[PDB]
């Protein structure tokens, strides 16, 4: 689907993990 | 050392807190995200959170301050996990207690030619509750001692 955007999905998952680690 | 994909993760996490886009994470936004994930804090807990990283004293978290907050949570969880992993190495049976036998076994496995009296001492000096065994809590207390 286009690695410039599906990479974006990977970075969305990365940022979400970071925000969980700060909430915890 | 630092990559653009890393900076992108940093930025996206910041914006997920800074939902309004003013460049600063207030206690309200910070609270709402924790709230949407279960755990509910008080504004005192929130203010302590901002306080630990408020380098400028402006009551909010700007980007470099969020970077520090991030690095500290990561390091905190890295140490907390190295301790969990070590504990699981010593507690050979998973019962949550390190026995004198288990410490004896692991230590001679590591090469440490300790006498029986040496392992009874290690056990006794980390045993707080005095049950002759070292539980996880006591393990942590020893691991992070000064
Ligand atoms: Ca904001
Ligand atoms: Ca503090
Ligand atoms: Ca600030
Ligand atoms: Ca055990
Ligand atoms: Ca104990």
Tab-separated table of N, CA and C in Angstrom, chain B:
chain	number	residue	atom	x	y	z
B	1	UNK	N	23.178	8.858	15.269
B	1	UNK	CA	22.613	8.247	16.464
B	1	UNK	C	21.093	8.345	16.432
B	2	UNK	N	20.567	9.553	16.267
B	2	UNK	CA	19.130	9.789	16.240
B	2	UNK	C	18.620	9.806	14.801
B	3	UNK	N	17.476	9.163	14.544
B	3	UNK	CA	16.956	9.059	13.179
B	3	UNK	C	15.676	9.867	12.996
B	4	UNK	N	15.417	10.259	11.738
B	4	UNK	CA	14.197	11.003	11.430
B	4	UNK	C	12.952	10.203	11.775
B	5	UNK	N	13.014	8.874	11.656
B	5	UNK	CA	11.864	8.057	12.022
B	5	UNK	C	11.655	8.090	13.518
B	6	UNK	N	12.757	8.216	14.263
B	6	UNK	CA	12.654	8.385	15.704
B	6	UNK	C	12.002	9.714	16.032
B	7	UNK	N	12.479	10.798	15.402
B	7	UNK	CA	11.920	12.127	15.652
B	7	UNK	C	10.437	12.137	15.310
B	8	UNK	N	10.051	11.384	14.276
B	8	UNK	CA	8.644	11.281	13.920
B	8	UNK	C	7.838	10.612	15.025
B	9	UNK	N	8.381	9.555	15.638
B	9	UNK	CA	7.663	8.934	16.752
B	9	UNK	C	7.546	9.906	17.918
B	10	UNK	N	8.624	10.644	18.182
B	10	UNK	CA	8.617	11.596	19.277
B	10	UNK	C	7.511	12.621	19.068
B	11	UNK	N	7.458	13.165	17.847
B	11	UNK	CA	6.519	14.218	17.489
B	11	UNK	C	5.091	13.714	17.562
B	12	UNK	N	4.847	12.512	17.034
B	12	UNK	CA	3.487	11.993	17.060
B	12	UNK	C	3.022	11.724	18.483
B	13	UNK	N	3.902	11.212	19.345
B	13	UNK	CA	3.496	10.988	20.731
B	13	UNK	C	3.164	12.309	21.420
B	14	UNK	N	3.967	13.341	21.135
B	14	UNK	CA	3.727	14.672	21.696
B	14	UNK	C	2.372	15.211	21.271
B	15	UNK	N	2.039	15.063	19.985
B	15	UNK	CA	0.764	15.570	19.495
B	15	UNK	C	-0.403	14.770	20.055
B	16	UNK	N	-0.213	13.468	20.278
B	16	UNK	CA	-1.276	12.713	20.926
B	16	UNK	C	-1.518	13.212	22.339
B	17	UNK	N	-0.518	13.837	22.961
B	17	UNK	CA	-0.877	14.496	24.208
B	17	UNK	C	-1.407	15.896	23.952
B	18	UNK	N	-0.677	16.669	23.147
B	18	UNK	CA	-1.000	18.056	22.802
B	18	UNK	C	-2.077	18.120	21.708
B	19	UNK	N	-3.270	17.666	22.078
B	19	UNK	CA	-4.326	17.476	21.101
B	19	UNK	C	-4.782	18.784	20.462
B	20	UNK	N	-4.618	19.912	21.164
B	20	UNK	CA	-5.021	21.224	20.670
B	20	UNK	C	-3.992	21.858	19.743
B	21	UNK	N	-2.728	21.481	19.849
B	21	UNK	CA	-1.691	21.976	18.959
B	21	UNK	C	-0.961	23.228	19.387
B	22	UNK	N	-1.103	23.646	20.638
B	22	UNK	CA	-0.425	24.835	21.131
B	22	UNK	C	1.042	24.609	21.478
B	23	UNK	N	1.578	23.408	21.261
B	23	UNK	CA	2.974	23.107	21.521
B	23	UNK	C	3.293	22.746	22.956
B	24	UNK	N	2.288	22.695	23.826
B	24	UNK	CA	2.518	22.402	25.229
B	24	UNK	C	1.464	21.415	25.704
B	25	UNK	N	1.873	20.496	26.575
B	25	UNK	CA	0.984	19.502	27.163
B	25	UNK	C	0.557	19.999	28.528
B	26	UNK	N	-0.703	20.361	28.674
B	26	UNK	CA	-1.165	20.769	29.986
B	26	UNK	C	-1.641	19.557	30.774
B	27	UNK	N	-1.843	19.783	32.073
B	27	UNK	CA	-2.330	18.741	32.973
B	27	UNK	C	-3.692	18.229	32.545
B	28	UNK	N	-4.525	19.105	31.983
B	28	UNK	CA	-5.823	18.676	31.477
B	28	UNK	C	-5.663	17.647	30.358
B	29	UNK	N	-4.844	17.955	29.347
B	29	UNK	CA	-4.649	17.012	28.248
B	29	UNK	C	-4.000	15.736	28.749
B	30	UNK	N	-2.957	15.906	29.559
B	30	UNK	CA	-2.268	14.783	30.168
B	30	UNK	C	-3.225	13.923	30.964
B	31	UNK	N	-4.150	14.543	31.678
B	31	UNK	CA	-5.100	13.765	32.441
B	31	UNK	C	-6.024	12.993	31.530
B	32	UNK	N	-6.592	13.675	30.532
B	32	UNK	CA	-7.545	13.035	29.630
B	32	UNK	C	-6.969	11.799	28.955
B	33	UNK	N	-5.677	11.806	28.626
B	33	UNK	CA	-5.169	10.620	27.931
B	33	UNK	C	-5.057	9.440	28.894
B	34	UNK	N	-4.600	9.697	30.115
B	34	UNK	CA	-4.564	8.656	31.134
B	34	UNK	C	-5.963	8.136	31.401
B	35	UNK	N	-6.930	9.050	31.432
B	35	UNK	CA	-8.323	8.723	31.703
B	35	UNK	C	-8.857	7.773	30.642
B	36	UNK	N	-8.658	8.124	29.373
B	36	UNK	CA	-9.085	7.277	28.268
B	36	UNK	C	-8.419	5.909	28.292
B	37	UNK	N	-7.402	5.728	29.128
B	37	UNK	CA	-6.737	4.447	29.269
B	37	UNK	C	-6.936	3.919	30.674
B	38	UNK	N	-8.152	3.995	31.190
B	38	UNK	CA	-8.331	3.337	32.464
B	38	UNK	C	-7.913	4.257	33.588
B	39	UNK	N	-6.773	3.915	34.215
B	39	UNK	CA	-6.170	4.638	35.333
B	39	UNK	C	-6.618	6.094	35.377
B	40	UNK	N	-7.061	6.532	36.560
B	40	UNK	CA	-7.563	7.876	36.821
B	40	UNK	C	-6.711	8.542	37.885
B	41	UNK	N	-6.076	9.630	37.560
B	41	UNK	CA	-5.235	10.323	38.526
B	41	UNK	C	-5.915	11.550	39.094
B	42	UNK	N	-5.231	12.224	40.007
B	42	UNK	CA	-5.702	13.488	40.550
B	42	UNK	C	-4.818	14.595	39.990
B	43	UNK	N	-5.328	15.833	39.986
B	43	UNK	CA	-4.509	16.934	39.480
B	43	UNK	C	-3.247	17.139	40.292
B	44	UNK	N	-3.217	16.660	41.530
B	44	UNK	CA	-1.954	16.696	42.250
B	44	UNK	C	-0.947	15.744	41.623
B	45	UNK	N	-1.386	14.524	41.313
B	45	UNK	CA	-0.520	13.553	40.654
B	45	UNK	C	-0.047	14.092	39.309
B	46	UNK	N	-0.964	14.751	38.599
B	46	UNK	CA	-0.671	15.388	37.318
B	46	UNK	C	0.385	16.480	37.470
B	47	UNK	N	0.212	17.334	38.468
B	47	UNK	CA	1.149	18.420	38.662
B	47	UNK	C	2.529	17.894	39.041
B	48	UNK	N	2.584	16.795	39.813
B	48	UNK	CA	3.876	16.191	40.157
B	48	UNK	C	4.546	15.684	38.895
B	49	UNK	N	3.732	15.121	37.983
B	49	UNK	CA	4.249	14.637	36.703
B	49	UNK	C	4.866	15.769	35.895
B	50	UNK	N	4.156	16.890	35.783
B	50	UNK	CA	4.691	18.009	35.014
B	50	UNK	C	5.922	18.567	35.709
B	51	UNK	N	5.872	18.620	37.050
B	51	UNK	CA	6.901	19.196	37.910
B	51	UNK	C	8.245	18.534	37.784
B	52	UNK	N	8.253	17.210	37.653
B	52	UNK	CA	9.531	16.524	37.603
B	52	UNK	C	10.336	16.945	36.379
B	53	UNK	N	9.666	17.343	35.292
B	53	UNK	CA	10.332	17.717	34.046
B	53	UNK	C	10.180	19.197	33.689
B	54	UNK	N	9.518	20.015	34.522
B	54	UNK	CA	9.320	21.423	34.168
B	54	UNK	C	10.592	22.236	34.357
B	55	UNK	N	11.541	22.037	33.443
B	55	UNK	CA	12.805	22.769	33.459
B	55	UNK	C	12.620	24.289	33.494
B	56	UNK	N	11.642	24.822	32.771
B	56	UNK	CA	11.486	26.271	32.692
B	56	UNK	C	10.608	26.864	33.804
B	57	UNK	N	9.839	26.026	34.496
B	57	UNK	CA	8.956	26.436	35.574
B	57	UNK	C	7.663	27.047	35.099
B	58	UNK	N	7.325	26.887	33.842
B	58	UNK	CA	6.123	27.463	33.256
B	58	UNK	C	4.874	26.611	33.437
B	59	UNK	N	4.857	25.692	34.397
B	59	UNK	CA	3.644	24.917	34.539
B	59	UNK	C	3.239	24.006	33.395
B	60	UNK	N	4.007	23.911	32.308
B	60	UNK	CA	3.621	22.992	31.241
B	60	UNK	C	4.846	22.246	30.742
B	61	UNK	N	4.602	21.297	29.862
B	61	UNK	CA	5.644	20.490	29.258
B	61	UNK	C	5.752	20.881	27.782
B	62	UNK	N	6.892	21.444	27.414
B	62	UNK	CA	7.145	21.695	26.010
B	62	UNK	C	7.897	20.498	25.455
B	63	UNK	N	8.271	20.570	24.181
B	63	UNK	CA	8.843	19.404	23.512
B	63	UNK	C	10.093	18.866	24.192
B	64	UNK	N	11.184	19.627	24.350
B	64	UNK	CA	12.363	19.020	24.988
B	64	UNK	C	12.044	18.476	26.366
B	65	UNK	N	11.075	19.088	27.063
B	65	UNK	CA	10.677	18.567	28.365
B	65	UNK	C	9.973	17.223	28.222
B	66	UNK	N	9.211	17.042	27.153
B	66	UNK	CA	8.585	15.755	26.899
B	66	UNK	C	9.627	14.726	26.500
B	67	UNK	N	10.690	15.165	25.834
B	67	UNK	CA	11.755	14.230	25.512
B	67	UNK	C	12.410	13.712	26.771
B	68	UNK	N	12.687	14.599	27.728
B	68	UNK	CA	13.249	14.135	28.995
B	68	UNK	C	12.277	13.210	29.718
B	69	UNK	N	11.010	13.614	29.840
B	69	UNK	CA	10.021	12.745	30.476
B	69	UNK	C	10.066	11.344	29.874
B	70	UNK	N	10.121	11.285	28.544
B	70	UNK	CA	10.185	10.021	27.819
B	70	UNK	C	11.438	9.224	28.194
B	71	UNK	N	12.608	9.875	28.157
B	71	UNK	CA	13.847	9.156	28.415
B	71	UNK	C	13.855	8.577	29.824
B	72	UNK	N	13.254	9.290	30.770
B	72	UNK	CA	13.223	8.821	32.149
B	72	UNK	C	12.267	7.651	32.303
B	73	UNK	N	11.102	7.693	31.655
B	73	UNK	CA	10.217	6.531	31.750
B	73	UNK	C	10.857	5.321	31.093
B	74	UNK	N	11.571	5.536	29.993
B	74	UNK	CA	12.195	4.395	29.343
B	74	UNK	C	13.250	3.793	30.244
B	75	UNK	N	14.139	4.624	30.770
B	75	UNK	CA	15.187	4.133	31.648
B	75	UNK	C	14.592	3.465	32.882
B	76	UNK	N	13.558	4.069	33.477
B	76	UNK	CA	12.890	3.469	34.624
B	76	UNK	C	12.379	2.077	34.303
B	77	UNK	N	11.748	1.911	33.152
B	77	UNK	CA	11.246	0.590	32.799
B	77	UNK	C	12.355	-0.373	32.382
B	78	UNK	N	13.483	0.135	31.881
B	78	UNK	CA	14.625	-0.721	31.556
B	78	UNK	C	15.253	-1.323	32.808
B	79	UNK	N	15.416	-0.507	33.838
B	79	UNK	CA	15.950	-0.991	35.095
B	79	UNK	C	14.957	-1.920	35.775
B	80	UNK	N	13.678	-1.534	35.800
B	80	UNK	CA	12.669	-2.388	36.416
B	80	UNK	C	12.602	-3.742	35.734
B	81	UNK	N	12.909	-3.787	34.438
B	81	UNK	CA	12.887	-5.070	33.751
B	81	UNK	C	14.168	-5.873	33.933
B	82	UNK	N	15.330	-5.223	33.997
B	82	UNK	CA	16.551	-5.950	34.317
B	82	UNK	C	16.432	-6.603	35.684
B	83	UNK	N	15.761	-5.926	36.612
B	83	UNK	CA	15.578	-6.541	37.917
B	83	UNK	C	14.597	-7.704	37.845
B	84	UNK	N	13.482	-7.551	37.120
B	84	UNK	CA	12.571	-8.693	36.986
B	84	UNK	C	13.258	-9.895	36.344
B	85	UNK	N	14.112	-9.642	35.367
B	85	UNK	CA	14.771	-10.734	34.674
B	85	UNK	C	15.765	-11.426	35.574
B	86	UNK	N	16.518	-10.643	36.357
B	86	UNK	CA	17.456	-11.264	37.283
B	86	UNK	C	16.714	-12.088	38.322
B	87	UNK	N	15.637	-11.520	38.888
B	87	UNK	CA	14.872	-12.268	39.871
B	87	UNK	C	14.424	-13.599	39.293
B	88	UNK	N	13.886	-13.587	38.068
B	88	UNK	CA	13.438	-14.834	37.460
B	88	UNK	C	14.574	-15.808	37.231
B	89	UNK	N	15.804	-15.307	37.105
B	89	UNK	CA	16.944	-16.208	37.001
B	89	UNK	C	17.222	-16.859	38.345
B	90	UNK	N	17.151	-16.087	39.423
B	90	UNK	CA	17.444	-16.673	40.723
B	90	UNK	C	16.307	-17.570	41.206
B	91	UNK	N	15.051	-17.172	41.017
B	91	UNK	CA	13.930	-17.993	41.490
B	91	UNK	C	13.662	-19.155	40.533
B	92	UNK	N	14.590	-20.114	40.540
B	92	UNK	CA	14.544	-21.244	39.616
B	92	UNK	C	13.207	-21.970	39.586
B	93	UNK	N	12.367	-21.882	40.626
B	93	UNK	CA	11.110	-22.621	40.574
B	93	UNK	C	9.893	-21.763	40.279
B	94	UNK	N	10.034	-20.444	40.205
B	94	UNK	CA	8.885	-19.619	39.913
B	94	UNK	C	7.953	-19.421	41.084
B	95	UNK	N	8.289	-19.957	42.257
B	95	UNK	CA	7.477	-19.783	43.454
B	95	UNK	C	7.545	-18.368	44.017
B	96	UNK	N	8.350	-17.487	43.425
B	96	UNK	CA	8.449	-16.132	43.914
B	96	UNK	C	9.386	-15.948	45.077
B	97	UNK	N	10.015	-17.021	45.548
B	97	UNK	CA	10.960	-16.965	46.648
B	97	UNK	C	12.256	-17.585	46.192
B	98	UNK	N	13.337	-16.908	46.494
B	98	UNK	CA	14.659	-17.429	46.239
B	98	UNK	C	15.058	-18.197	47.492
B	99	UNK	N	15.295	-19.491	47.334
B	99	UNK	CA	15.740	-20.323	48.432
B	99	UNK	C	17.265	-20.313	48.512
B	100	UNK	N	17.769	-20.818	49.636
B	100	UNK	CA	19.209	-20.934	49.809
B	100	UNK	C	19.786	-21.857	48.764
B	101	UNK	N	19.054	-22.930	48.452
B	101	UNK	CA	19.502	-23.846	47.412
B	101	UNK	C	19.571	-23.152	46.069
B	102	UNK	N	18.545	-22.367	45.731
B	102	UNK	CA	18.518	-21.741	44.416
B	102	UNK	C	19.666	-20.764	44.260
B	103	UNK	N	19.912	-19.955	45.277
B	103	UNK	CA	21.029	-19.030	45.196
B	103	UNK	C	22.339	-19.788	45.057
B	104	UNK	N	22.480	-20.894	45.807
B	104	UNK	CA	23.694	-21.716	45.786
B	104	UNK	C	23.962	-22.248	44.388
B	105	UNK	N	22.892	-22.713	43.740
B	105	UNK	CA	22.990	-23.327	42.429
B	105	UNK	C	23.367	-22.292	41.391
B	106	UNK	N	22.593	-21.209	41.326
B	106	UNK	CA	22.859	-20.154	40.356
B	106	UNK	C	24.269	-19.622	40.524
B	107	UNK	N	24.685	-19.373	41.769
B	107	UNK	CA	26.000	-18.787	41.973
B	107	UNK	C	27.099	-19.721	41.495
B	108	UNK	N	27.031	-21.014	41.842
B	108	UNK	CA	28.127	-21.831	41.332
B	108	UNK	C	28.021	-21.984	39.820
B	109	UNK	N	26.814	-21.836	39.251
B	109	UNK	CA	26.659	-21.855	37.795
B	109	UNK	C	27.362	-20.664	37.165
B	110	UNK	N	27.265	-19.504	37.805
B	110	UNK	CA	27.907	-18.282	37.351
B	110	UNK	C	29.414	-18.325	37.551
B	111	UNK	N	29.914	-19.360	38.212
B	111	UNK	CA	31.323	-19.518	38.455
B	111	UNK	C	31.704	-19.184	39.869
B	112	UNK	N	30.844	-18.453	40.573
B	112	UNK	CA	31.134	-17.978	41.919
B	112	UNK	C	31.249	-19.154	42.876
B	113	UNK	N	32.480	-19.417	43.296
B	113	UNK	CA	32.777	-20.456	44.267
B	113	UNK	C	32.513	-19.866	45.649
B	114	UNK	N	31.232	-19.805	45.999
B	114	UNK	CA	30.844	-19.356	47.324
B	114	UNK	C	30.621	-20.522	48.279
B	115	UNK	N	31.041	-20.327	49.519
B	115	UNK	CA	30.790	-21.338	50.525
B	115	UNK	C	29.326	-21.285	50.948
B	116	UNK	N	28.870	-22.349	51.616
B	116	UNK	CA	27.490	-22.373	52.095
B	116	UNK	C	27.206	-21.183	52.985
B	117	UNK	N	28.166	-20.868	53.857
B	117	UNK	CA	28.014	-19.751	54.762
B	117	UNK	C	27.914	-18.435	53.992
B	118	UNK	N	28.554	-18.358	52.807
B	118	UNK	CA	28.472	-17.149	51.987
B	118	UNK	C	27.066	-16.972	51.396
B	119	UNK	N	26.419	-18.071	50.990
B	119	UNK	CA	25.067	-17.922	50.439
B	119	UNK	C	24.027	-17.723	51.544
B	120	UNK	N	24.210	-18.347	52.709
B	120	UNK	CA	23.309	-18.082	53.824
B	120	UNK	C	23.388	-16.615	54.234
B	121	UNK	N	24.570	-16.005	54.070
B	121	UNK	CA	24.713	-14.591	54.387
B	121	UNK	C	23.990	-13.722	53.376
B	122	UNK	N	24.148	-14.033	52.088
B	122	UNK	CA	23.446	-13.255	51.076
B	122	UNK	C	21.940	-13.310	51.331
B	123	UNK	N	21.433	-14.516	51.615
B	123	UNK	CA	20.005	-14.694	51.851
B	123	UNK	C	19.584	-13.914	53.079
B	124	UNK	N	20.362	-14.020	54.166
B	124	UNK	CA	19.969	-13.371	55.413
B	124	UNK	C	19.995	-11.858	55.294
B	125	UNK	N	20.981	-11.304	54.584
B	125	UNK	CA	21.085	-9.854	54.455
B	125	UNK	C	20.050	-9.264	53.509
B	126	UNK	N	19.454	-10.043	52.624
B	126	UNK	CA	18.367	-9.464	51.842
B	126	UNK	C	16.992	-9.839	52.373
B	127	UNK	N	16.910	-10.737	53.348
B	127	UNK	CA	15.615	-11.156	53.870
B	127	UNK	C	15.117	-10.135	54.882
B	128	UNK	N	14.042	-9.435	54.545
B	128	UNK	CA	13.439	-8.454	55.442
B	128	UNK	C	12.398	-9.102	56.339
B	129	UNK	N	11.460	-9.843	55.739
B	129	UNK	CA	10.405	-10.489	56.507
B	129	UNK	C	10.946	-11.609	57.377
B	130	UNK	N	12.162	-12.076	57.105
B	130	UNK	CA	12.792	-13.073	57.948
B	130	UNK	C	12.240	-14.467	57.762
B	131	UNK	N	11.849	-14.822	56.544
B	131	UNK	CA	11.318	-16.145	56.277
B	131	UNK	C	12.368	-17.072	55.705
B	132	UNK	N	13.636	-16.669	55.737
B	132	UNK	CA	14.686	-17.512	55.210
B	132	UNK	C	14.729	-17.583	53.709
B	133	UNK	N	13.810	-16.885	53.039
B	133	UNK	CA	13.721	-16.802	51.598
B	133	UNK	C	13.657	-15.345	51.188
B	134	UNK	N	14.047	-15.095	49.946
B	134	UNK	CA	14.035	-13.760	49.366
B	134	UNK	C	12.921	-13.739	48.341
B	135	UNK	N	11.904	-12.932	48.604
B	135	UNK	CA	10.821	-12.693	47.667
B	135	UNK	C	11.181	-11.582	46.674
B	136	UNK	N	10.251	-11.284	45.772
B	136	UNK	CA	10.518	-10.258	44.771
B	136	UNK	C	10.734	-8.888	45.403
B	137	UNK	N	9.890	-8.513	46.362
B	137	UNK	CA	10.020	-7.188	46.949
B	137	UNK	C	11.402	-6.992	47.544
B	138	UNK	N	11.840	-7.970	48.353
B	138	UNK	CA	13.155	-7.905	48.974
B	138	UNK	C	14.241	-7.945	47.916
B	139	UNK	N	13.980	-8.648	46.824
B	139	UNK	CA	14.968	-8.675	45.770
B	139	UNK	C	15.177	-7.293	45.197
B	140	UNK	N	14.078	-6.592	44.940
B	140	UNK	CA	14.159	-5.247	44.388
B	140	UNK	C	14.859	-4.319	45.355
B	141	UNK	N	14.479	-4.396	46.630
B	141	UNK	CA	15.102	-3.542	47.630
B	141	UNK	C	16.610	-3.684	47.615
B	142	UNK	N	17.111	-4.920	47.482
B	142	UNK	CA	18.559	-5.082	47.448
B	142	UNK	C	19.145	-4.564	46.149
B	143	UNK	N	18.487	-4.871	45.028
B	143	UNK	CA	19.021	-4.524	43.718
B	143	UNK	C	19.202	-3.032	43.533
B	144	UNK	N	18.312	-2.226	44.108
B	144	UNK	CA	18.341	-0.785	43.903
B	144	UNK	C	18.874	-0.030	45.118
B	145	UNK	N	19.598	-0.719	46.008
B	145	UNK	CA	20.135	-0.113	47.222
B	145	UNK	C	21.385	0.719	46.930
B	146	UNK	N	21.643	1.682	47.818
B	146	UNK	CA	22.802	2.573	47.708
B	146	UNK	C	23.822	2.339	48.836
